[PDB]
């Protein structure tokens, strides 16, 4: 269904992705005193769109990867009606695959 | 507060200049002396209107201090005079 | 002495301006290429149908 | 057979993520530079020179 | 680059070496363009072998047209290679200098030699001839560099300058192109975003029309001299025949790939004399690909299905744009704690200071009410 295993790529750079977690994250702790909230309706601020674009790239990658984590990537990937619905979908098969497992070992 | 000068403005009114959008506005809507944000600035009616911004003692959140890579461009050549030099 | 440098020092505000709308001009355009990509995986129950058809069930 | 299949995105997307975190880096430095202009500013302790620079 | 001992030693020890180098260069360099003269001639277009004149709309002025005054010869390979062609290109250089300076020399007789003095002390506008080791050309090469670094920032500016107060974009990928076009060598600019430029500046300005002051800063930043200048249609001369030999190279090139067959030092050269990759960058073969990659990709399919390149104006702004290094930023962010007018505290605050820090300091809203009540009360009392 797939098709053929996509050509490898050599990585330009070295780097763990929790280590750029990591980093985000010290990041983002600088500006926590500057970060000021506001409506969604009103125009963001440069730390408010630093922090959508690192996180929504780092829940995207951390969903491809296997680490279903619905809490957040509710939160810094859902900007389209169409993410809710795939949120609400994948909560769902997950929910479903834990119980049908319980119960194919029950 | 000190008697230091501040931004020049060559007595010129910024709420009425031909460049005044560069000049940001303030809450009571009167426009900067200088590009920063100034809480206080002030206009004066002589024979002609002039801007002024009166020094104050204000706090503002300092974010922490950046690494020396991602702000210095070692890109000096032997021509160059820094602006502190050839004052 | 002191021609130059007050032009110099007129043009200061108006460039400043201008290079912090340009740079805020580049964050956007770097906000709004960004884009989820959801991707959607053949669905395990053909697979089961076609595990019970390979049984002759 | 999924991870290899989701493996060139993850890759490239990874360093996508390093050289965005490396270009934001700079724009918060030259947000703290214009905080200490700002601040220096309002004290009447700027010179224009300083600012230049 | 200012001039030294060390470079002078260095220029009078390689003087006659150079002088005979330079002569067998002249030699070998006269067969290449006659071969090259005798092609266009014989197989070059009407109106590029008759010189069609171009005058400008406002003042009538002939200068080279690109579209008719430059021809492109596909089939130059037949009779003359590559190399040659950057032979050619790297004498015609280097001659014009050596001209210019006999020309001083003839003018002033026996005078000229304290200035020659100065002109050995700088490897400025010494030919490549004078350097018989890599260290001597590589330092060569660094004040080539120096040069195109002083000058090109001048052109770019008075083009965006002039362009920006005069006229703007009609669309916004023109915006864009622009924007981007003017960017420092510091990020990686996408030619297809910026060839619409070219288009733009051609309803603005055609290399017919380029003013003489701008032209003069092209030569420097092209390693041109440029005195004496004289009339603008002879450095203009001088541009239109380099870049006819670049872009017949080019097409070159792009038909028979030579490039990714080319040497690393080779092809350091190339994009060198394309003014794309700067020596003191140490880059590798990776980044000179990508940089030569972009420029034939700017040069755009056009180029190789007709031989007709995007407007010269912004094909040199975009290739020295490499040079446009970041503004230089010096110290330690701990030098904006320090304050500027301490020799002032001593003198304190008039009475005119004191007045205007009480009525626009904290207390100024206080202040202003008690005056406006006062104005108020005055006036009523008045009336
Ligand atoms: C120590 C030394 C002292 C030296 C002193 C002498 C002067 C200086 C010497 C030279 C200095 C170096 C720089 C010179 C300027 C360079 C200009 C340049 O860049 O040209 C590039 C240009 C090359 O570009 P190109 O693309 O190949 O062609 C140009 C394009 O056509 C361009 O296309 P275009 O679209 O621009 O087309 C227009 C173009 C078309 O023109 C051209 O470009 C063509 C070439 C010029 C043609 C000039 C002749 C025209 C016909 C004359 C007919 C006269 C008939 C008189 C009959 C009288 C009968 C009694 O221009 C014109 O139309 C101009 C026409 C000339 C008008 C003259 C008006 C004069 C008014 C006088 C007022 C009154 C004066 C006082 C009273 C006098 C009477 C009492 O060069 C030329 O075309 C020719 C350059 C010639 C340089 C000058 C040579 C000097 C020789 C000196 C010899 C004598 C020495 C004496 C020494 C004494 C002891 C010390
Ligand atoms: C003894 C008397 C002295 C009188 C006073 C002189 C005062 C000094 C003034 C300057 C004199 C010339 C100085 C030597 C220059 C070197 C030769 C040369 O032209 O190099 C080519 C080169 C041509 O430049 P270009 O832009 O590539 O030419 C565009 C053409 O489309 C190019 O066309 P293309 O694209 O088809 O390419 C052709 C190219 C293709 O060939 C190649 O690519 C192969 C290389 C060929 C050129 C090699 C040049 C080598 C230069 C270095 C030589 C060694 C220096 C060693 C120094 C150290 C020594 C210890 O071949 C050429 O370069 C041919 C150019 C045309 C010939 C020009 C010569 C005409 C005069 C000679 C004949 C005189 C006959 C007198 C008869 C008398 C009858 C009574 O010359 C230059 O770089 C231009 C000169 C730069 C300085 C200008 C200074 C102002 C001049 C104003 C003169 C005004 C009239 C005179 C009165 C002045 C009163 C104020
Ligand atoms: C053996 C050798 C091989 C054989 C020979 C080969 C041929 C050789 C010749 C050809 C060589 C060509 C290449 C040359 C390159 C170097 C050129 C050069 O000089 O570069 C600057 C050169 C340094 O170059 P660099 O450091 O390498 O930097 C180069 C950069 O790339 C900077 O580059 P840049 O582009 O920024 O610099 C360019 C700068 C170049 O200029 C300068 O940099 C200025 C240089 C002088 C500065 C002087 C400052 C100090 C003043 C001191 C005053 C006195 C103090 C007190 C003394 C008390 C003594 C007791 O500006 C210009 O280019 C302006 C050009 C102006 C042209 C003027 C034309 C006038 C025409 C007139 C109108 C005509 C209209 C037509 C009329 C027609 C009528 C019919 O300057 C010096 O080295 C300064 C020397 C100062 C000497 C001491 C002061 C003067 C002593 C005078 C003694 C007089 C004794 C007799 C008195 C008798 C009384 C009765
Ligand atoms: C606070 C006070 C301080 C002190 C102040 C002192 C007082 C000053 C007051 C007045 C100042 C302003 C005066 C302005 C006058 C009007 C100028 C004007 O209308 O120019 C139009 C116009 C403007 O020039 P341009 O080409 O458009 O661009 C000029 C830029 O500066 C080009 O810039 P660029 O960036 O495009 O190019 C840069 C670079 C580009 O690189 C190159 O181009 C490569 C290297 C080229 C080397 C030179 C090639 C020359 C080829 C032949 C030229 C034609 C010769 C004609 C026949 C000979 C006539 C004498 O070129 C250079 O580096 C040029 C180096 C030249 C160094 C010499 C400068 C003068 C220093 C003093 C030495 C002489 C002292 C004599 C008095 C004392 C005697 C004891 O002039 C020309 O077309 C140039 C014609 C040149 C003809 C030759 C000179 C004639 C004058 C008489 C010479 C007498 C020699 C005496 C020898 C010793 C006898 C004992
Ligand atoms: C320390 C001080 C010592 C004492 C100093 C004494 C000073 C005397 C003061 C009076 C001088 C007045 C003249 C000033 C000349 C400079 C003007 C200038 O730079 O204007 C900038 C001006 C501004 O340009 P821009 O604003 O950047 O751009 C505007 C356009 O886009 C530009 O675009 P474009 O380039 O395409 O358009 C221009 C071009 C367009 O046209 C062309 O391209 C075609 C060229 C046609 C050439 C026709 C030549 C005809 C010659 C016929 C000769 C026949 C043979 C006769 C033989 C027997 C008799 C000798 O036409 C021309 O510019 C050429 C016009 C004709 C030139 C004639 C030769 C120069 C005569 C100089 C003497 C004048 C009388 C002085 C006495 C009265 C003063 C009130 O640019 C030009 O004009 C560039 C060319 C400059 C050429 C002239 C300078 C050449 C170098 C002189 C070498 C000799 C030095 C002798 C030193 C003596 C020391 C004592
Ligand atoms: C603007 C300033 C002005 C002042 C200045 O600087 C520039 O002007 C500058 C112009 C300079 C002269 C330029 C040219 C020479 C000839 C050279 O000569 C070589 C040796 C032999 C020739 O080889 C000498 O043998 C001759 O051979 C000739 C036959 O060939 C015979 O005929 C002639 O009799 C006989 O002596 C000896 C040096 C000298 C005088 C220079 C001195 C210094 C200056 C005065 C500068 C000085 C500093
Ligand atoms: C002091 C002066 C210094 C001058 C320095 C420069 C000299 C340059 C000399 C170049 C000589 C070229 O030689 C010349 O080339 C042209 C072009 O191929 C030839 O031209 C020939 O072919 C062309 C093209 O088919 C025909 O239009 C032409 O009718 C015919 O004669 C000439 O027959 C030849 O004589």
Known sequence: ?106 | ?87 | ?57 | ?53 | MQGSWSVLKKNCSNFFPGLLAFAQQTQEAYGIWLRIYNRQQKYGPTDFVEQSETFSPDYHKRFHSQDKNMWVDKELCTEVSQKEVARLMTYKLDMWRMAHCAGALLATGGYAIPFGLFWLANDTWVPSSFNLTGEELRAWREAQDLYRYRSAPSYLTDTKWHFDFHAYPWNETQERAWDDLFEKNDVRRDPKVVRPAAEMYDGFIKFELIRRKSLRHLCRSMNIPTFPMLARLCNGTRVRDYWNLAWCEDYMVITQRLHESMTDEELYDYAWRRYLAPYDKNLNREQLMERVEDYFEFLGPDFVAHGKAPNLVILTNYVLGYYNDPAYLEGDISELDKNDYDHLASWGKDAFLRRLEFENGPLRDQVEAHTQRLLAERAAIAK
């Open chain 3, 1 to 57: 002495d002191i021609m130059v440098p007050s032009f110099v020092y007129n043009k200061l505000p108006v460039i400043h301006f201008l290079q912090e709308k340009r740079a805020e001009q580049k964050l956007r355009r770097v906000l709004d290429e960004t884009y989820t990509e959801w991707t959607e995986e053949l669905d395990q129950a053909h697979v089961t149908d076609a595990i019970t058809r390979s049984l002759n069930i």
């Open chain 4, 1 to 53: 057979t999924l991870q290899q299949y989701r493996r060139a995105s993850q890759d490239k997307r990874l360093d996508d993520l390093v050289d965005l975190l490396e270009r934001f880096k700079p724009v918060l430095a030259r947000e703290a530079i214009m905080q200490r202009l700002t601040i220096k500013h309002l004290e009447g302790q700027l010179g224009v020179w300083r600012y230049m620079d």
């Open chain 1, 1 to 106: 269904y797939k098709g053929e295993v996509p050509p490898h790529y050599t990585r330009k750079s070295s780097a763990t992705i929790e280590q750029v977690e990591k980093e985000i994250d010290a990041l983002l702790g600088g500006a926590e005193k500057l970060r000021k909230t506001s409506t969604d309706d009103q125009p963001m601020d440069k730390l408010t769109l630093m922090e959508r674009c690192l996180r929504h790239a780092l829940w995207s990658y951390h969903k491809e990867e296997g680490r279903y984590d619905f809490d957040q990537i509710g939160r810094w990937v859902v900007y389209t009606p169409e993410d809710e619905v795939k949120l609400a979908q994948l909560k769902r098969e997950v929910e479903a695959k834990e119980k049908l497992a319980a119960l194919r070992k029950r």
């Open chain 2, 1 to 87: 507060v000190g008697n230091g000068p501040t931004f020049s403005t060559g007595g010129e009114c910024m709420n009425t200049c031909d460049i005044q959008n560069a000049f940001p506005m303030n809450d009571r809507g009167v426009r900067s002396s200088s590009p920063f944000q100034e809480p206080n600035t002030a206009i004066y009616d002589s024979y002609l209107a002039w801007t002024y911004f009166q020094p104050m003692d204000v706090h503002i959140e300092k974010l922490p201090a950046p690494e020396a890579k991602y702000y210095q461009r070692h890109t000096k050549k032997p021509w160059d005079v820094s602006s502190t030099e050839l004052t």
